[PDB]
mmCIF file of C-alpha atoms in Angstrom:
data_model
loop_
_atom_site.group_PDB
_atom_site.id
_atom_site.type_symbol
_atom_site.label_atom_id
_atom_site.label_comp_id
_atom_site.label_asym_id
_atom_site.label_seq_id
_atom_site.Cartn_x
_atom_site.Cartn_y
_atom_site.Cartn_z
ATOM 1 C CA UNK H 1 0.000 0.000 0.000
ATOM 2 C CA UNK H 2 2.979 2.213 0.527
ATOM 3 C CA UNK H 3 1.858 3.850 3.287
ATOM 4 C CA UNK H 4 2.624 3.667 6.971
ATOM 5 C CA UNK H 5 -0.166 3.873 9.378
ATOM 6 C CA UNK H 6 -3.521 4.132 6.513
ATOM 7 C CA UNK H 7 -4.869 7.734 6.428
ATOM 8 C CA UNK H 8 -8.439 8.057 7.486
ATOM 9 C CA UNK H 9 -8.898 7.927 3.905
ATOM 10 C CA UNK H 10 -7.515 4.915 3.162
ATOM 11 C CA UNK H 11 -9.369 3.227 5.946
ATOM 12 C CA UNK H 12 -12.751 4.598 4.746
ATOM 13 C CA UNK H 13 -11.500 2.987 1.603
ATOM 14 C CA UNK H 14 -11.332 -0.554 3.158
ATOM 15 C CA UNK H 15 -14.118 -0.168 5.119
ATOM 16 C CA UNK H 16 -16.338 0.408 2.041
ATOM 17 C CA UNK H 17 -15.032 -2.843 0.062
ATOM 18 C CA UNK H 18 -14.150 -5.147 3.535
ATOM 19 C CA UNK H 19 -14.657 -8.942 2.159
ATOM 20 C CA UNK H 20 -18.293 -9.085 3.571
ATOM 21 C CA UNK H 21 -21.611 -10.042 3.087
ATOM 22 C CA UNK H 22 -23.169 -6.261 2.837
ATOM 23 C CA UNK H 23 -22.453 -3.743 0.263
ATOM 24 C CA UNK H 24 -20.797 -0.036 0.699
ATOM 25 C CA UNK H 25 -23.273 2.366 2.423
ATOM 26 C CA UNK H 26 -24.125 5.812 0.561
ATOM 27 C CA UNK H 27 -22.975 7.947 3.331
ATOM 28 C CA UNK H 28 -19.888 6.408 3.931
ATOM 29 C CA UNK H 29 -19.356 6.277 -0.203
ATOM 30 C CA UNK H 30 -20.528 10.148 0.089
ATOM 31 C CA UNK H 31 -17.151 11.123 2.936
ATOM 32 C CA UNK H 32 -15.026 9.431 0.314
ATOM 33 C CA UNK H 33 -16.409 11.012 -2.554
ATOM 34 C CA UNK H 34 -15.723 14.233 -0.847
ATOM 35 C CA UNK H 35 -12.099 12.881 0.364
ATOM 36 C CA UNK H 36 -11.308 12.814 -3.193
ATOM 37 C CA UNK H 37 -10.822 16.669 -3.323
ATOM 38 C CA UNK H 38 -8.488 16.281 -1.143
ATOM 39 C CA UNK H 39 -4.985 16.619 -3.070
ATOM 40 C CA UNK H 40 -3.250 13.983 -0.884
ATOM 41 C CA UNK H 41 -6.318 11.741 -0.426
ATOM 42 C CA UNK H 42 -7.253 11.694 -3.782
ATOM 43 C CA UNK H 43 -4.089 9.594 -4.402
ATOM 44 C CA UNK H 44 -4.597 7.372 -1.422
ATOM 45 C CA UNK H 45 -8.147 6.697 -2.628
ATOM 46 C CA UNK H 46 -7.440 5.814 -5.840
ATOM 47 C CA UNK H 47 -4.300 3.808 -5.354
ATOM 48 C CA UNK H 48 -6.692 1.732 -2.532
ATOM 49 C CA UNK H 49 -9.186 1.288 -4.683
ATOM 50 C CA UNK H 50 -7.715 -0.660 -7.650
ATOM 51 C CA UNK H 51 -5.651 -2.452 -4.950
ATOM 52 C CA UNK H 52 -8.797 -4.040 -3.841
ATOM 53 C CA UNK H 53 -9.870 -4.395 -7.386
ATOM 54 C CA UNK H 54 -6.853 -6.356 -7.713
ATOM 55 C CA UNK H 55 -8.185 -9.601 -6.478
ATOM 56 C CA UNK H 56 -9.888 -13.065 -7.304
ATOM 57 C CA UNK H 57 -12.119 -16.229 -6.668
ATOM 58 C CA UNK H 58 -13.732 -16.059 -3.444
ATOM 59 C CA UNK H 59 -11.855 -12.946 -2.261
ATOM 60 C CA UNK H 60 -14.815 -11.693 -4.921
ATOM 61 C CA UNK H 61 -16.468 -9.178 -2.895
ATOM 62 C CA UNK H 62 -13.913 -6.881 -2.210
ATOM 63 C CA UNK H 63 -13.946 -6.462 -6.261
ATOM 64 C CA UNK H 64 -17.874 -6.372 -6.282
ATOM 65 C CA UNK H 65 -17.506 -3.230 -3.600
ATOM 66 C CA UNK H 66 -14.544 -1.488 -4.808
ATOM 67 C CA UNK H 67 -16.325 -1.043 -8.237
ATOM 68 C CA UNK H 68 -18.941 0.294 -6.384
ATOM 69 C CA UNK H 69 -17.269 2.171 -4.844
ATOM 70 C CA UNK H 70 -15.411 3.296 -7.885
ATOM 71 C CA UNK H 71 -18.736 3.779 -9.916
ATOM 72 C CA UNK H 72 -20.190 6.019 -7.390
ATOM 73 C CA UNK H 73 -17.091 8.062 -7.183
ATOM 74 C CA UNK H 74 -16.930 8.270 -10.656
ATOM 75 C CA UNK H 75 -20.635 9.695 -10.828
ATOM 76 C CA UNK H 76 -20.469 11.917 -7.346
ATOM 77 C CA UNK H 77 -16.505 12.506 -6.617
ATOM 78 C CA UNK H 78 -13.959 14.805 -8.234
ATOM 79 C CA UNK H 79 -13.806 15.190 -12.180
ATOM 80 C CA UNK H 80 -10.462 13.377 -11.461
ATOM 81 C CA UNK H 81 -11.236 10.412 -10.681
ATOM 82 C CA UNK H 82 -13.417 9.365 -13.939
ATOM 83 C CA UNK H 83 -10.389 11.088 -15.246
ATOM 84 C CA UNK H 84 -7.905 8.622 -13.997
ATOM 85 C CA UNK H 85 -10.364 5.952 -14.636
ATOM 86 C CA UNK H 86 -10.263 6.872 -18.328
ATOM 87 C CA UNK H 87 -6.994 6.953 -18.841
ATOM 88 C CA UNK H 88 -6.229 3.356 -17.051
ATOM 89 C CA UNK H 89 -9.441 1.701 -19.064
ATOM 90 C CA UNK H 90 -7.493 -1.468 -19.758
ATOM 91 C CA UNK H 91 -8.094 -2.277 -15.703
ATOM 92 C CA UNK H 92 -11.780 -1.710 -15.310
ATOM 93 C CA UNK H 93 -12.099 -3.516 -18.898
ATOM 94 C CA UNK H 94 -10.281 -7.031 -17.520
ATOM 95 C CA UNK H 95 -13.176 -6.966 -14.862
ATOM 96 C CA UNK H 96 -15.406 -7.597 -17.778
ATOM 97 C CA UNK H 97 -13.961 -11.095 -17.436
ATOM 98 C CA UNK H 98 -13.514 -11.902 -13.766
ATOM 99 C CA UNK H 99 -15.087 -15.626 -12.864
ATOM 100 C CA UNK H 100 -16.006 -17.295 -9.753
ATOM 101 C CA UNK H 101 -18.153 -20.135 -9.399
ATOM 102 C CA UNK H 102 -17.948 -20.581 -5.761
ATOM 103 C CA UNK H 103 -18.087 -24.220 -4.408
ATOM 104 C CA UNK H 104 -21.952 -24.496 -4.306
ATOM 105 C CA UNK H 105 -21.538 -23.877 -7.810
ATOM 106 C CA UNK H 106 -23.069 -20.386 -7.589
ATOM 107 C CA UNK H 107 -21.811 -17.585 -10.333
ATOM 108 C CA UNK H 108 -20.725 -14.813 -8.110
ATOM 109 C CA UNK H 109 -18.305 -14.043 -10.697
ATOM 110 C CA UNK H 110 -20.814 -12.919 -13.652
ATOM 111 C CA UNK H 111 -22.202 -10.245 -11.176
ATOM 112 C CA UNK H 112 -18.601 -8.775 -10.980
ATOM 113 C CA UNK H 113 -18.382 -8.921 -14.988
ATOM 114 C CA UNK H 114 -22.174 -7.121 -15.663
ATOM 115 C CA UNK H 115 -21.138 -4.282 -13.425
ATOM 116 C CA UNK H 116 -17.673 -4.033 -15.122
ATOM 117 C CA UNK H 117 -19.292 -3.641 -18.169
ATOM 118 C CA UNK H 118 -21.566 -1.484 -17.270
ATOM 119 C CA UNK H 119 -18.819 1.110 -16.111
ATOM 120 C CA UNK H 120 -17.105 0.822 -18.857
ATOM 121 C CA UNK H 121 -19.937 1.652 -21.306
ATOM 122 C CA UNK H 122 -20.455 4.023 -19.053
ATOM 123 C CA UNK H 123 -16.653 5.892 -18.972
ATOM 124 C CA UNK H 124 -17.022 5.687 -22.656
ATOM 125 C CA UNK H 125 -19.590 7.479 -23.277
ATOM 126 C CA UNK H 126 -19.265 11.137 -22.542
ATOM 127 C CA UNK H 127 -22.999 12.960 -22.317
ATOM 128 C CA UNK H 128 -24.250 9.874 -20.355
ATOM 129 C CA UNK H 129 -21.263 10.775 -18.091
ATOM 130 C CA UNK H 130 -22.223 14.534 -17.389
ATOM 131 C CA UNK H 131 -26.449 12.798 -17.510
ATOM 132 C CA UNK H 132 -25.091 10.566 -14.300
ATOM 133 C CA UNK H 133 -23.250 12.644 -12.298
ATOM 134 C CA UNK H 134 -25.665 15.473 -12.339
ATOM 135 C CA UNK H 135 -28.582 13.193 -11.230
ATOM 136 C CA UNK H 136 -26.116 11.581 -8.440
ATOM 137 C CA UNK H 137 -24.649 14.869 -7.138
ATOM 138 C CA UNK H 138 -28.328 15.568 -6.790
ATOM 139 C CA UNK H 139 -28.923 12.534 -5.008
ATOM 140 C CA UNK H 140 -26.433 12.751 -2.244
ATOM 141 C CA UNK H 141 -27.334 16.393 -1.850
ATOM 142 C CA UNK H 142 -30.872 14.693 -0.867
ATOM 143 C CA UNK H 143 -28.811 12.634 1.216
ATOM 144 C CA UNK H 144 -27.387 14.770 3.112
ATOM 145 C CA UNK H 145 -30.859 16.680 4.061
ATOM 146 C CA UNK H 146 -33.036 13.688 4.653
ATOM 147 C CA UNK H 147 -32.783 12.568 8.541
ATOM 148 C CA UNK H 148 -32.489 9.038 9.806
ATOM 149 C CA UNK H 149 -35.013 6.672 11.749
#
């Protein structure tokens, strides 16, 4: 990870894709997202993230969740990071690939392939880009004024 003692960034980053049975939640997704203004965190973030995209077989989840992560930072996040995400295509397009058949013969894997492809269509294509992130900025400023239970 290159890093001594993880920033509070890079924590939030782990936290969001830990290897478990429950997906990122939006307001921990929307303190990243904001993170990634953040000159130094902005590298931490991203460097974490494809780290935990870098994985396989049953370790499956923590892909699953980073691109979640990834796609909602992408949409809500600094302009940066679809930037970056752009420019290293080739390693969100491999996803579109990733298998797992776990040992109850359940395809976890093709999950982790439909989102990957998904993204990508979606990094591709310009107007749909500016469409998205407009609607999800919206959304987590709904977020952010809507109180718990």
């Amino acid at each position: 990870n290159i890093v001594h003692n993880y920033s509070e960034a890079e924590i939030k980053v782990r936290e969001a894709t830990s290897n478990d049975p429950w997906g990122p939640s939006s307001s921990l997704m929307s303190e990243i997202a904001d993170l990634t203004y953040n000159v130094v965190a902005f590298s931490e973030i991203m460097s974490m993230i494809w780290k935990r995209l870098n994985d396989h077989g049953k370790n499956w989840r923590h892909v699953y969740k980073a691109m979640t992560l990834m796609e909602y930072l992408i949409k809500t996040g600094s302009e940066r990071v679809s930037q970056q995400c752009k420019e290293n295509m080739y390693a969100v397009q491999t996803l579109k690939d990733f298998q797992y058949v776990d040992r109850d013969g359940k395809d976890q894997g093709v999950n982790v392939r439909e989102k990957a492809k998904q993204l990508v269509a979606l990094l591709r294509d310009e107007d749909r880009l500016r469409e998205e992130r407009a609607h999800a900025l919206k959304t987590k400023e709904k977020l952010a004024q809507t109180a718990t239970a």
